[PDB]
Design an enzyme around this catalytic site. Structure first.
Site, PDB file in Angstrom:
ATOM      1  N   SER A  72      39.067 -47.899  28.574  1.00  0.00           N
ATOM      2  CA  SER A  72      39.176 -48.415  29.163  1.00  0.00           C
ATOM      3  C   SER A  72      39.938 -50.190  29.607  1.00  0.00           C
ATOM      4  O   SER A  72      40.379 -51.074  28.092  1.00  0.00           O
ATOM      5  CB  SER A  72      37.627 -49.046  29.854  1.00  0.00           C
ATOM      6  OG  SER A  72      37.948 -49.608  30.442  1.00  0.00           O
TER       7      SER A  72
HETATM    8  C1  LIG Z   1      45.144 -49.354  34.744  1.00  0.00           C
HETATM    9  C2  LIG Z   1      43.944 -49.046  35.937  1.00  0.00           C
HETATM   10  N1  LIG Z   1      44.433 -48.616  37.101  1.00  0.00           N
HETATM   11  C3  LIG Z   1      43.915 -47.840  37.928  1.00  0.00           C
HETATM   12  C4  LIG Z   1      41.896 -48.327  37.464  1.00  0.00           C
HETATM   13  C5  LIG Z   1      41.620 -48.155  38.643  1.00  0.00           C
HETATM   14  O1  LIG Z   1      40.807 -49.147  40.105  1.00  0.00           O
HETATM   15  P1  LIG Z   1      39.577 -48.740  40.886  1.00  0.00           P
HETATM   16  O2  LIG Z   1      38.901 -48.667  40.403  1.00  0.00           O
HETATM   17  O3  LIG Z   1      39.031 -50.283  41.236  1.00  0.00           O
HETATM   18  O4  LIG Z   1      40.887 -48.230  42.451  1.00  0.00           O
HETATM   19  C6  LIG Z   1      42.081 -48.584  36.437  1.00  0.00           C
HETATM   20  C7  LIG Z   1      40.296 -49.271  36.381  1.00  0.00           C
HETATM   21  N2  LIG Z   1      39.216 -49.243  35.377  1.00  0.00           N
HETATM   22  C8  LIG Z   1      37.887 -49.228  34.903  1.00  0.00           C
HETATM   23  C9  LIG Z   1      38.331 -49.455  32.719  1.00  0.00           C
HETATM   24  O5  LIG Z   1      36.853 -48.974  32.547  1.00  0.00           O
HETATM   25  O6  LIG Z   1      38.839 -50.277  32.697  1.00  0.00           O
HETATM   26  C10 LIG Z   1      37.284 -48.060  35.282  1.00  0.00           C
HETATM   27  C11 LIG Z   1      36.904 -49.116  35.595  1.00  0.00           C
HETATM   28  C12 LIG Z   1      42.806 -49.078  35.551  1.00  0.00           C
HETATM   29  O7  LIG Z   1      42.599 -49.714  34.598  1.00  0.00           O
END
Ligand SMILES: Cc1ncc(COP(=O)(O)O)c(CNC2(C(=O)O)CC2)c1O
Ligand SMILES: Cc1ncc(COP(=O)(O)O)c(CNC2(C(=O)O)CC2)c1O
Lengths: 341, 341
Positions: B78
């Protein structure tokens, strides 16, 4: 005076920002007010970094010419090679990298050390990455020339870019512009920096900062924390660059020597020490700013060391120069276990 | 739509810059003019990213009250957990991060996926990294509340930061500000973007952009590229966040649906397909810009596919949104073998 008389090709968003590491300040005794020039927040080209500043003054020649390959050289996790690949891509040119072995790959990493980090990024960018294994030397190598002769015979026009650009005629111009920036930023922020702490190994960065700061008679503000563990050649080459660059930009000043701490280079180039890792943890833990075990890590330990030994005048504003290099952290995941409790 | 009505806390250098990827645009047949708003170059806090922009509207609520620990959740790699760790290291608070098993770790990345990349960085910042086995899910997770109770039982005052800050009440405000920036940047560029392409998983980013663009009645310019592989929930949660944020700021219009191209999530969240790898490579080789196998690589392949099928009006200015993620690229090295020349 005047770096302005030299052609520059933009590769960054503009003047690198300056961070106010006030929280790390207090953690160290509130003796000094630490600040950080973020060269690691350079541009959109594969994470940015100090080498991009240097390349801006080299690119014009590449483009004006009619070369077809950008050949550079470094060691395994070499940051420069990664940024040169990024440059070749942006220039729509070929790229040949040479990742020699300059660091005794700590067994607990003999696997990922060659598959991850900066070397992975050069591959993704489509550069002809060649994994050689020769000794460490911040000077010209007997392989970099072979690759050159190689591409030439093939019928191509290769453009050479030595390690750290340190031996490239314009290798020191970029950080001369770095000095011009700081001076201008001191006025915008309304904060005068008494000293400038920056890591050093091949030269150009420090030298450019010396020759550039000299424009304002402030060379002395510079404090180069070694990291090559070879103060010998390292301090000499940096000086050879400092003088040459000075001539190019018109500064008559003659550099005979400069502040080059060497108490944090051990145990070797690329390998950290309990103090290094402790600095990274502390900086990261305090400012949320990441630093690597090779360059910015050691130069940061030295910075925290000096702040301890009340080296700086009480209340002094010190400018830490973050040259980047954090993308190599992945090839050193073993040195950072999870927080105790 | 008064987003300024909400307190904001500085975590970025200011308005994210916009890169003109004219080389990639040409490479793709000169169909459109591709630009990229760089959320991946927004701050000095451990590489930065989209989460940071979201957090700026949540930090005020934190520091205001009395909370000891900041707790978030995400996959092993994440980005949000890695940036929360920094925000914690900065706000001078404790950090407990739950890394669920949201991705079928490829066999070639098994002895790396959990020690390298983002998880590593989060550890260097002294975060209490808890690796749990629970699987993928963008909704409120059990392990989350359990830790919120655990700590609150040990006598602390943890602050709940759900995945992607999407479930959080202020999670959408962040990108509503993005929209603002876009409209202003169109003014300074002297151009107008016809479409905005952006990756979407937990929903807060797209929802913010949607509610924001709605302030100017341009919500239809938004094109989200799914990467969750779970159309229903992602669309439904994004739609939910977008409507709440709509009220907070003041926008009346209600979102009953929005453009979510689900063609590229395949084969599943956290795993790239051959098209993703191809896209990452094409962008990297053309611009020197790095995209990740989980989020941006897919939104980028979606961008490329859409341009091939002539989805955009000729000469259309399309704004691609880079949300970061590249730091995790180290846990997917097997997917990018050295190209041949
Ligand atoms: C590079 C990248 N792109 C899109 C998203 C998703 O965005 P949304 O869910 O807000 O539409 C993450 C999210 N991250 C999470 C994590 O655990 O890192 C799911 C929350 C992202 O890191
Ligand atoms: C983060 C960081 N800090 C300092 C330096 C050293 O610069 P100087 O050679 O100009 O002293 C590097 C360089 N990089 C090299 C590479 O191979 O990446 C040796 C050239 C650096 O990346």
């Amino acid at each position: 005076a005047g770096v302005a008389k030299f052609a520059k090709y933009p590769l960054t968003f503009g003047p690198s920002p300056i961070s106010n590491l006030n929280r790390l300040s207090q953690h160290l005794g509130s003796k000094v007010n630490v600040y950080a020039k973020r060269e690691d927040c350079n541009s959109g080209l594969a994470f940015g970094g100090n080498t991009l500043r240097k390349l801006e003054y080299i690119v014009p020649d590449i483009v004006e010419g009619d070369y077809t390959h950008l050949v550079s050289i470094g060691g395994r996790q070499s940051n420069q090679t990664r940024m040169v690949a990024a440059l070749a891509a942006k220039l729509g040119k070929k790229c040949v990298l040479i990742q020699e072995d300059w660091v005794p790959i700590p067994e607990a990493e003999k696997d990922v050390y060659n598959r991850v980090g900066n070397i992975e990024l050069s591959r993704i960018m489509g550069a002809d990455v060649r994994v050689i294994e020769d000794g460490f030397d911040i000077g010209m190598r007997k392989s970099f020339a072979n690759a050159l002769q190689e591409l030439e015979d093939a019928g191509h026009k290769p453009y050479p870019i030595p390690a750290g650009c340190s031996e490239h005629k314009y290798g020191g111009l970029g950080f001369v512009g770095f000095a011009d920036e700081v001076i201008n930023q001191e006025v915008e922020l309304g904060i005068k920096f008494d000293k400038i702490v920056v890591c050093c190994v091949t030269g150009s960065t420090t030298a450019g900062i010396l020759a550039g700061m000299a424009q304002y008679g402030r060379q002395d503000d510079v404090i180069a924390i070694d990291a090559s563990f070879t103060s010998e050649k390292t301090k000499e080459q940096t000086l050879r660059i400092a003088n040459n660059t000075a001539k190019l930009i018109g500064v008559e000043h003659e550099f005979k020597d400069f502040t080059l701490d060497t108490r944090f280079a051990y145990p070797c180039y690329g390998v950290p020490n309990e103090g290094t890792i402790e600095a990274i943890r502390t900086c990261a833990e305090q400012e949320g700013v990441l630093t690597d075990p090779v360059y910015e890590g050691k130069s940061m330990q030295g910075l925290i060391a000096l702040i301890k030994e009340d080296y700086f005048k009480p209340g002094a504003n010190v400018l830490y120069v973050h040259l980047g290099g954090a993308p190599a952290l992945s090839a050193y995941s073993s040195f950072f276990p999870t927080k105790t409790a």
